[PDB]
Design a protein around this ligand. Structure first.
Ligand SMILES: *[C@@H]1O[C@H](CO)[C@@H](O[C@@H]2O[C@H](CO)[C@@H](O[C@@H]3O[C@H](CO[C@H]4O[C@H](CO)[C@@H](O)[C@H](O[C@H]5O[C@H](CO)[C@@H](O)[C@H](O)[C@@H]5O)[C@@H]4O)[C@@H](O)[C@H](O[C@H]4O[C@H](CO)[C@@H](O)[C@H](O)[C@@H]4O[C@H]4O[C@H](CO)[C@@H](O)[C@H](O)[C@@H]4O)[C@@H]3O)[C@H](O)[C@H]2NC(C)=O)[C@H](O)[C@H]1NC(C)=O
Ligand SMILES: *[C@@H]1O[C@H](CO)[C@@H](O[C@@H]2O[C@H](CO)[C@@H](O[C@@H]3O[C@H](CO[C@H]4O[C@H](CO)[C@@H](O)[C@H](O)[C@@H]4O)[C@@H](O)[C@H](O[C@H]4O[C@H](CO)[C@@H](O)[C@H](O)[C@@H]4O)[C@@H]3O)[C@H](O)[C@H]2NC(C)=O)[C@H](O)[C@H]1NC(C)=O
Ligand SMILES: *[C@@H]1O[C@H](CO)[C@@H](O[C@@H]2O[C@H](CO)[C@@H](O[C@@H]3O[C@H](CO)[C@@H](O)[C@H](O)[C@@H]3O)[C@H](O)[C@H]2NC(C)=O)[C@H](O)[C@H]1NC(C)=O
Ligand SMILES: *[C@@H]1O[C@H](CO)[C@@H](O)[C@H](O)[C@H]1NC(C)=O
Ligand SMILES: CCCCCCCCCCCC
Ligand SMILES: CCCCCCCCCCCC
Ligand SMILES: CCCCCCCC
Ligand SMILES: CCCCCCCC
Ligand SMILES: CCCCCCCC
Ligand SMILES: CCCCCCCC
Lengths: 101, 99, 318
């Protein structure tokens, strides 16, 4: 597996289905013309390389597998000093469905 | 391209069998570390916190016979990440509160 | 795949510690900026915040490949594997890249050897404001950068044709100022460690006094008028005149301090300081006018409005 090349490179366009769950709409700072918002930033995509078949249909894993595989480099165009939470462990989840999603 | 290949062998030779744990001339005479500063700015003198903030180009030079080469006649400037593979003085500022 | 083999070949026997053409010729780097937003200008601390997409490109003969693929478009993963110039910003009080959701870096490699490397940066640059005439001051805030270690014989910079793609200025956090225009330079600064090529971008910022008028001048103008109505008040009303006089001058002191508070601790009188001091003279003189009056009223009714409006005439034109 090559972590550097996106899924379907040279044959497809990688379609990333995203969605947001706002856990809490933070305060608005009119002095700084900014606002804070805490979210569960969900994004899903198809990766044929990560296709398996075994006793289980979905592998519920931790952040360690995320760094080993290609993930979209999504960034916020108008973002200003966001933080990805780290306590107790990196607040992330990865789930690989048998079809590769 | 000879220099690119030749320079690669030289730098690779030096860092091979190099022990970062031992200072230059370990178990021998002290290593003379020369220091040289260039103050970029003194941001703010604070009486409330009894401190000042200073930005400088802190430079220090010393000799290391292990890192001596003579095949190429030029001074090699390398990536800053090489500093993590070389012994450097453990200089600290006894006054600094946050640097 | 056929792209993973290419990347393996490029990094095979690739020395990340050596610049392109080391000991052969200087490495020419073409820089380019897209100013996403010039953030708040911090006149008190003499700094400003700028968010940019700092793009710099160079040739690296080691990273040349021939195939049907014209460019290898990559994420931040490969940035640490290849040689990247050690560009730093000379006047940055504090800067940081962006890391949410992942490192905001991009990397593209062509067949011939071109490398395009861009990253998003928030730079808290240092702009040395000279507020001798405030709040009418105009500044030319720079942004210098160069290689920290590589001298002029090893790293040469140069502005691309598209110097600076300044973005839509409407959404900028620049409230005090207006972005007049930009100007670039390229010069060699000599230092103790060698001669380094420096490239600086000058942003011209022109102050707006609309806030300070309502914030500072208009309260300062209106309070001065409160002194003048002392004259129309009867002289026999000793507590009334002093009440107006002492109340008028004393609140002038508070206005000067709070107005002076907006400025930093600089040891020179500024134009805002000049206005409040002159307003201080009028209120003080108005109180002193009654002091001599009890111990003339009509003349003060004419001279005081004329002197202030005339004084404003001299001040504002300047
Ligand atoms: C004294 O102690 C302090 C700790 O108190 C040390 O500071 C720490 O140093 C380490 C190592 O340099 C830093 O780790 C690196 O962090 C990178 C991103 O950090 C961002 O998030 C952290 C929070 O997690 C913030 O603190 C950072 O901001 C602070 O630091 C920056 C400078 O880094 C300042 O500018 C800021 O003002 C803050 O002060 C950042 O916002 C992280 O990317 C990096 O990991 C990459 O690099 C390593 C290098 O081997 C790789 O192993 C790793 O896999 C990553 O590489 C991937 O990403 C790069 C990105 O381009 C690609 O190029 C690669 O190819 C690959 O894809 C590393 O983890 C740490 O952040 C920092 N601060 C802490 C811990 O608070 C001092 O260094 C230490 N020494 C001295 C002299 O002071
Ligand atoms: C790799 O890096 C080294 C060091 O940075 C370079 O060597 C320097 O080369 C320059 C170019 O000639 C030298 O410049 C002059 O050298 C004179 C010789 O002095 C020698 O004698 C004593 C030793 O006891 C020391 O002064 C010195 O370290 C030398 O060993 C100096 O006397 C000169 O001093 C003054 O010159 C003028 C006077 O107006 C001033 O402008 C200078 O700033 C200085 O005050 C001058 O320094 C330099 O001395 C060399 N230094 C060393 C340590 O060798 C290599 O050239 C470089 N290699 C490259 C680029 O390929
Ligand atoms: C940012 O810096 C760049 C680099 O100096 C500026 O662009 C460069 O401008 C010079 C001067 O105009 C160009 O040279 C001139 O070209 C014209 C047109 O061919 C020619 O008639 C002149 O005799 C002279 O040769 C230079 O080509 C150009 N850079 C490139 C890559 O072409 C740019 O103007 C600066 N941005 C500003 C000032 O806002
Ligand atoms: C790469 O291939 C092209 C044609 O396929 C050839 O012209 C070129 O010389 C080659 N470059 C090399 C081998 O460096
Ligand atoms: C709070 C300000 C008090 C008045 C200051 C008097 C000193 C002279 C200021 C004008 C000098 C050009
Ligand atoms: C009594 C005077 C109040 C208004 C002064 C305005 C002066 C504008 C100057 C414009 C530049 C010539
Ligand atoms: C000496 C300070 C001014 C006091 C008022 C004097 C009126 C003649
Ligand atoms: C009797 C004259 C009073 C002052 C005239 C108005 C000046 C503002
Ligand atoms: C301050 C202007 C109004 C008063 C003018 C008429 C006074 C007799
Ligand atoms: C621009 C604010 C000052 C206007 C002139 C006021 C003079 C009485």
């Amino acid at each position: 597996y090559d972590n550097r090349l996106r899924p379907g490179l040279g044959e497809r366009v990688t379609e990333v289905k995203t969605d947001i769950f706002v856990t809490s709409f933070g305060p608005v700072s009119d002095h700084d013309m900014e606002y804070t918002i805490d979210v569960f930033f969900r994004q899903s995509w198809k990766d044929e390389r990560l296709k398996f078949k075994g006793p289980m249909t979905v592998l519920r894993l931790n952040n360690l597998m995320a760094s080993k595989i290609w993930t979209p480099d999504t960034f916020f165009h108008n973002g200003k000093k966001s933080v990805a939470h780290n306590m107790t462990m990196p607040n992330k989840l990865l789930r690989i469905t048998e079809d590769g999603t | 391209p000879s220099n690119m290949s030749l320079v690669k062998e030289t730098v690779d030779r030096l860092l091979k069998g190099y022990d970062i744990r031992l200072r230059p001339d370990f178990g021998g005479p002290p290593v003379a570390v020369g220091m040289n500063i260039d103050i970029a700015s003194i941001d703010m003198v604070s009486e409330v916190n009894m401190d000042y903030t200073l930005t400088m180009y802190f430079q220090q030079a010393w000799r290391d016979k292990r890192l001596s080469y003579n095949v190429i006649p030029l001074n090699l400037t390398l990536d800053n990440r090489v500093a993590d593979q070389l012994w450097v003085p453990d200089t600290y500022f006894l006054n600094d509160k946050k640097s | 795949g056929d792209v993973t083999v290419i990347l393996n070949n490029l990094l095979e026997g690739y020395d990340n510690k050596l610049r392109p053409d080391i000991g052969v010729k200087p490495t020419l780097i073409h820089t380019d900026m897209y100013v996403n937003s010039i953030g708040p200008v911090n006149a008190i601390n003499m700094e400003y915040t700028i968010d940019i997409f700092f793009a710099q490109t160079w040739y690296d003969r080691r990273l040349k490949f021939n195939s049907t693929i014209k460019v290898l478009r990559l994420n931040s993963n490969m940035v640490g594997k290849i040689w990247i110039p050690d560009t730093f910003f000379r006047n940055s009080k504090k800067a940081d890249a962006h890391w949410i959701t992942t490192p905001n870096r991009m990397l593209r490699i062509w067949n011939d050897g071109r490398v395009l490397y861009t990253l998003r940066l928030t730079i808290d640059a240092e702009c040395q404001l000279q507020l001798h005439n405030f709040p009418m001051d105009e500044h030319s805030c720079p942004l210098e950068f160069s290689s920290y270690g590589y001298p002029r014989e090893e790293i040469v910079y140069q502005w691309k044709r598209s110097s600076v793609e300044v973005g839509d200025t409407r959404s900028w956090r620049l409230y005090q100022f207006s972005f007049v225009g930009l100007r670039n330079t390229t010069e060699v600064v000599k230092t103790t460690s060698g001669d380094y090529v420096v490239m600086s971008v000058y942003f011209d910022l022109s102050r707006r006094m609309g806030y300070f008028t309502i914030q500072t001048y208009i309260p300062c103008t209106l309070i001065v008028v409160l002194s003048w109505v002392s004259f129309w008040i009867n002289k026999d009303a000793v507590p009334a005149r002093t009440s107006l006089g002492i109340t008028t001058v004393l609140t002038m002191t508070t206005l000067s301090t709070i107005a002076r508070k907006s400025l930093p601790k600089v040891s020179y009188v500024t134009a805002m300081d000049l206005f409040v001091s002159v307003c201080f003279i009028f209120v003080f003189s108005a109180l002193v006018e009654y002091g001599t009056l009890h111990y003339m009223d009509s003349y003060a009714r004419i001279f005081f409005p004329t002197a202030f409006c005339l004084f404003n005439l001299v001040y504002w034109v300047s």
